[PDB]
Point group: C3
Chain length 40, copies 3
């Protein structure tokens, strides 16, 4: 039970990191594409 609540909490946290970071990566990628486009 402690194992299982802590495992659930661990997955909840990782899901939240995953989404936050994919979004950051996505925004970073759009900025890099816009700068490349500018310099074209």
């Amino acid at each position: 039970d402690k194992w299982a609540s802590l495992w659930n909490w661990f997955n909840i946290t990782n899901w939240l990191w995953y989404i936050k970071i994919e979004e950051l990566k996505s925004k970073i990628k759009r900025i890099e594409n816009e700068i490349k486009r500018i310099k074209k």
Copy 2:
């Protein structure tokens, strides 16, 4: 105790990571705000 200690270690690590990621996200937000201003 061993479960409580793991919970604590995980929460402390997660908080410190949280602070650091919000700082990246702000740098991104500022760059976005600035590109938007340039394209105006």
Copy 3:
């Protein structure tokens, strides 16, 4: 019980490491962007 404890401890350090590598790459990319923006503005 201990074995589960160890699994969760190992999963937390492996995932924490994988995120570390990931975020370091991102901090690099942001720095490159900021420096490029300062260069253009100078």
